[PDB]
Write a protein that binds this ligand. Structure first.
Ligand SMILES: COc1ccc(NC(=O)Nc2ccncc2)cc1
Ligand SMILES: COc1ccc(NC(=O)Nc2ccncc2)cc1
Ligand SMILES: [Cl-]
Ligand SMILES: [Cl-]
Lengths: 695, 697
């Protein structure tokens, strides 16, 4: 059920032993020694990774190393579509702008921070949540010359439990992290967008990197003289596999949760955030789909835009299903009522006052938040010409010296990026007419961005005429219209440009709404400090984990499937057979790699198939994960690596507010399938030989 | 494979059925010289199965079986299709015009009699052995002089089985006064609607209730206000013990057709011609129809039934092709015929190998013609609406060329034009479908094989399909209402003879009939060779583990209540519940609306004695019985012969089961009798029907 602090391992160890954990407490996490914790990394700032060899080899997801694989891909060597397997350490590709962070030490600094905070004076100060203030405190505690006295190391203080607990992390950062291996996109992204958030899942979501360091193992940026890192701890790979009900645990960096939402915050998330995103993206995607299906050239241009929009749309559908069917609102209401009744018993009314403050703030910002989500989903991300060029003050005070030619070249560059190879003005006019029609019916005249008032005033409610006029008269309506402007550019032309005025007034309204809504965050944040303090004083730390905040956490559970609906059961494990069932040569998502199809036909599974001769692919567990847990190591009862976390099912997206024991599962790629792909697809035996594989 | 057995075969299967869990005595299920459960089974309205469930002639069948009767009695004032119907007294039960129930009174083996009569073989290639006219003459000769007059209600019929190797005579008793008694609302009777068709898990309460009426003596009589309910020889008891995984289950009913003795070449033909053409052509048609329905809500209203009708056989073809591709149907037919050829070589009788060769050679010879026939039938005859536009008759044409018969000819033509261009017909949507359908057709069918008018696409329109279709509507008398009225005011036969839509419809129907006539001769050599082929299979492996193809005659099938795994890591259990109906509820989707009386029954958990041991309310279950079309409404029996459900569908993974039964995929989709009794009781409030039935604890 939780995403636990490392400090909480002691308090949970007894329950973990009852659930099947066999390894000693300090072999997993030791606060003043080496443990398994020392093989877990924050990969490229938002993913998890793990060290799997004495020479710094690292495993993470394919979608985590995707940008590094794409940056090294050319028409001649397409590593993204064909995979990449460096046959020697010297062939491993360096990557610019990459990092791996180890959590060297973690210390509770709550009393220190709470004492420093007593010197504030303003009771409404938000310094208790300020990264700048907490960094000043971290520097004061670690020392002035800390990064110079301890190279590669840095410190950081984070707030937990709404400002009721503080931890200082000593981090070791390596920036020479090289690409070692990756499966083809047919394996790494098999389900592609169709199978995203889906269980059963048949995706071999992995990529391999290697940490490089100086001669002493200290962090150093890319240098041709860098040598692989010999780490203090690395994971052993298990080949025993998994069985139903087996104990499993994960370590990683879950990003965000909202476990202490009030019932009113759940209502707001459903009725404003989710409903607006669902309604607006459904209109947008609907128009985009008709156009993509009618013109194959539009399908090529709008496919990535369509897929990007669908991702958070599917998350919202999954979240709204949980609110509707799993009683998320009711359970938050029961949580806050239990605290209010206990606070009445103790004679302390501050907890009931805190819930009231949150409720009143949510109620007060409802119309503004609705207007913000309406313009953001509807126009800012809904209409492409909302992001068309707007002349800067420097560019206008140049058009009215030959700095006029400098202004037109900068504006031209931005116009070229807006109307690129993937931009269709005809498809954009069709999307805008549908998106604006919905927007104009939901936002009243007195609340509209200034230019949108012209629909009623100048165009007599004709949205198609308003959009047609924007393109017909704008200098950014076509290439010819822009070149005519660039030949005779006047600031008067730009000041009255219908597309410039549209983009300007929709962005003005978007910023005005953002600025008006920002003040409402602080009273809720301050009230949550009191609210969570009461919940902890009443029920304690065990069941009540702190919200995820991109810090190292552990979660445990079992390898177990679930029933998604009446009379249907999804087991705990998928197989290579399931990849072959899904094979569609004419669907780019479900194409199967010929070397992999051959392994399946010949049963060339070696030491990786199960006791029944079936080749596993993925498995699912009752662990509690969220975004940031991509690439997380999955451990046995003995701490040996059995898989990598890569997703969670859609029925569990509401798990960021309330864990769903009967639906929520972590989708993990089996480590036996990872080794099968490295071995029989990549032929990279040197990586298998480098790992410590246990029978 | 796991058969649809003749009643004659119950004797030689009985020990296997008992070993599998059957507890009832053989002759209590079927006895040729006396009353048995077989007497409570009926052929309902010519194509469904039904069952008598009371001593007063009450009959259960599917909702989709009694759907036309429910619709005919529905008005704006009393919409029985939408709200349901529950006659609170026998006098309130509604009569139905053109309805029948057929009982199979006696079944007799007449093989020797027919084979002896056939020896008067004036021609060895005679198809009289399969002729309904010839076999009826033989049935009449055997039954006697004016049998129907001497036994009012009774009739006799002989059918061929095993490709002409076995013949049975059936004595049928037909009742035509069959009244509507009860029906659930459509939100229960057709819950999944088109989305859940051929789908398991299934949550549909597919049932309707009728009652057989007869004269004072229980003899068949047409509708009369003096008719009285029938007291039957036998009726089913209703069980409330329910089902458990692996429980024995059996069905009796009238499966219509199977192709269990197809050669491997016939399976290839079915896949590559029949199914691939239907799949490709309906996919183009449905694709255009969908874009238009999604763009104009008025087009969605007009084309919804046409879209759904086209999808039904399209889904069946996808399911059938999946089985051919993944379950080795072709290979198993090849193994069957190779086994026979090897055995025939050992016996020194080459006629079986010669029979399979005849079938193969015939299939190979008709390939181009059959491809052209399916291409025009799926592509144009069914694919394009203006293919069925009016064609002036020889008499209508003659009338327009010196009497008042001219105005009668125009009124007849107008009537047909009005039926073609009806409230649901869109010329714009039809031009869009035709342009896509004809483009694919012109791509597949060469110039020298095209219907005469379609040659104009290349010759007159320079390959512009859109121009050809645009011209048909622009110049045709049936292109618009105004174009028709202009014709009707000044009608000339010259105008009709050169009309582009008339010429299109005429030449596509000419080519369709030419292809049909050229292909008909190829049926007879295959049929004659199948008589020799099945004779060998029966002589080699016996009339024991290979059942005769379904032919709309009474059969029994047995198996177990069991689910299946459709794909890797997914299991579908054997039983659905009321909870599953509630999960699927969508108030804005007409298919998944949930009746308020049913929703409250669930919330209140008002399940009476109908819920299972765990307190869950059962809805449907699935079994390894072998069913096909015609089995809709079939009674599902316990190990004791008590009614536990009504068959109403089969999953798509089992549609290939008409050629080869699929033990690990094929399942009959049955509505639980406890759910039927819950709907009658708590949704209809019709206690008199529950009191009338013999319900066992
Ligand atoms: C909204 O109008 C509609 C009218 C009819 C249908 N269903 C239908 O025709 N189903 C069908 C099932 C099996 N065989 C043939 C046809 C659906 C929607
Ligand atoms: C097109 O190629 C293939 C088609 C089917 C399979 N798998 C298979 O037999 N199905 C199966 C059903 C249920 N559970 C596990 C497996 C493999 C390849
Ligand atoms: Cl280290
Ligand atoms: Cl099977």
């Amino acid at each position: 059920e939780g995403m636990w602090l490392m400090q909480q391992l002691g308090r949970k160890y007894a329950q973990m032993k009852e659930r099947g954990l066999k390894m000693k407490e300090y072999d997993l996490y030791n606060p003043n020694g080496t443990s398994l914790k020392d093989a877990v990394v924050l990969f490229d700032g938002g993913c998890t990774g793990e060290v799997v060899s004495d020479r710094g080899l690292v495993l993470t997801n394919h979608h985590c190393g995707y940008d590094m694989i794409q940056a090294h891909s050319t028409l001649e060597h397409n590593y993204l579509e064909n995979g990449f397997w460096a046959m020697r350490e010297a062939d491993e590709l360096p990557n610019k702008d990459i990092s791996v962070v180890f959590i060297d030490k973690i210390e509770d600094v709550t009393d220190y921070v709470k004492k420093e905070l007593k010197a504030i004076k303003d009771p409404n100060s938000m310094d208790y949540l300020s990264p700048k203030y907490l960094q000043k405190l971290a520097d004061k505690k670690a020392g002035k010359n800390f990064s110079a006295k301890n190279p590669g190391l840095s410190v950081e203080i984070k707030a937990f439990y709404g400002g009721n607990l503080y931890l200082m992390f000593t981090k070791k950062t390596y920036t020479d992290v090289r690409l070692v291996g990756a499966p083809p996109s047919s394996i790494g992204k098999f389900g592609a967008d169709t199978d995203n958030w889906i269980w059963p899942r048949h995706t071999g979501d992995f990529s391999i990197f290697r940490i490089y360091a100086d001669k002493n193992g200290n962090p150093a940026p890319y240098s041709e003289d860098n040598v692989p890192l010999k780490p203090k701890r690395f994971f052993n790979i298990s080949l025993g596999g998994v069985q139903e009900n087996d104990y499993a645990m994960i370590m990683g960096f879950p990003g965000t949760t909202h476990r202490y939402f009030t019932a009113s915050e759940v209502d707001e998330w459903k009725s404003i955030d989710n409903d607006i995103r669902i309604r607006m993206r459904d209109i947008r995607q609907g128009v985009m789909l008709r156009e993509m299906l009618a013109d194959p050239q539009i399908k090529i241009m709008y496919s990535a835009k369509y897929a990007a929009s669908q991702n958070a749309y599917k998350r919202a559908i999954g979240a709204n299903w949980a609110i509707k069917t799993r009683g998320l609102r009711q359970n938050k209401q029961a949580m806050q009522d239990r605290l209010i009744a206990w606070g009445a018993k103790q004679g302390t009314p501050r907890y009931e006052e805190a819930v009231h403050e949150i409720d009143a703030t949510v109620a007060k910002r409802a119309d503004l938040r609705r207007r913000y989500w309406m313009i953001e989903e509807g126009i800012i991300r809904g209409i492409e010409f909302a992001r068309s060029p707007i002349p800067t003050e420097d560019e206008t005070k140049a058009l009215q010296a030959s700095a006029r030619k400098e202004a037109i070249d900068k504006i031209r560059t931005r116009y070229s990026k807006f109307a690129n190879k993937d931009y269709s003005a005809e498809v954009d006019k069709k999307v805008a007419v549908a998106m604006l029609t919905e927007y104009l019916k939901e936002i009243p005249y007195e609340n509209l961005p200034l230019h949108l008032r012209l629909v009623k005033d100048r165009f007599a409610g004709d949205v198609q005429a308003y959009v047609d006029d924007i393109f017909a008269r704008s200098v950014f309506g076509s290439e010819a219209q822009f070149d005519a402007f660039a030949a005779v550019p006047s600031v008067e032309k730009l000041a009255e440009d219908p597309m410039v005025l549209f983009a300007s007034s929709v962005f003005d309204e978007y910023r005005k709404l953002y600025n008006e809504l920002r003040p409402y965050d602080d009273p809720i944040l301050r009230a949550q400090r009191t609210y969570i303090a009461g919940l902890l004083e009443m029920d304690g730390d065990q069941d009540q984990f702190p919200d995820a905040n991109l810090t190292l956490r552990f979660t445990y559970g079992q390898v177990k499937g679930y029933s998604p609906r009446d009379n249907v059961y999804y087991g705990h494990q998928t197989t290579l057979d399931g990849v072959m069932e899904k094979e569609d040569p004419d669907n780019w998502e479900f194409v199967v790699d010929p070397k992999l199809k051959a392994v399946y036909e010949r049963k060339d599974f070696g030491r990786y198939a199960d006791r029944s001769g079936r080749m596993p692919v993925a498995f699912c567990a009752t662990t509690h994960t969220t975004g940031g847990n991509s690439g997380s190591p999955v451990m046995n009862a003995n701490g040996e690596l059995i898989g990598l976390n890569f997703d969670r099912n859609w029925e569990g997206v509401g798990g960021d507010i309330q864990y769903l024991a009967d639906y929520q599962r972590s989708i993990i790629v089996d480590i036996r399938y990872v080794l099968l792909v490295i071995d029989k697809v990549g032929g990279c035996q040197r990586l298998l030989d480098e790992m410590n594989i246990v029978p």
